Every structure is written in C-alpha cells, then in structure tokens.
C-alpha cells in the first residue's frame, strides 16, 4: 500500500546511493535485506519494480 510505495522509494534512493559511493557489495546486502521486506509485505509489484530497478543502474 502506502508503506511498500514509500519502501520501494527508499530502497531506489538507498542503493543507489550506496552505489555511486562505491560499496558493490554493501549495496547489494541493502537490496537483497530491501527485496525480502516488500516481499513478505505481500507486494510482489514492488520488489519486481525494485528489481528492474537496479538491473538498469548496473
């Protein structure tokens, strides 16, 4: 609902940050801990945006 949207706004910000910093893998750990919570929050259009998210940053 509205905490997965604010989630997956946070998620893009966070990891993209953390990957322009350096951190490749710090920034994958913040993604992948990221991916489960909007998981279990029932919100598979989420984590599949998140997802399609980061592919493209790369």
């Avoid at 279990?40 to 599949?48: C, E, M, Q, T, Y």
Wanted: aromatic letters at 6%; charged letters at 45%; a negative charge.
């Amino acid at each position: 609902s509205e905490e997965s949207e604010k989630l997956l706004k946070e998620a893009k910000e966070e990891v993209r940050r953390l990957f322009e910093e350096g951190r490749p893998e710090d920034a994958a750990r913040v993604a992948f801990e990221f991916l489960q919570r909007l998981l279990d929050l029932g919100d598979p259009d989420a984590v599949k945006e998140l997802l399609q998210f980061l592919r493209e940053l790369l």
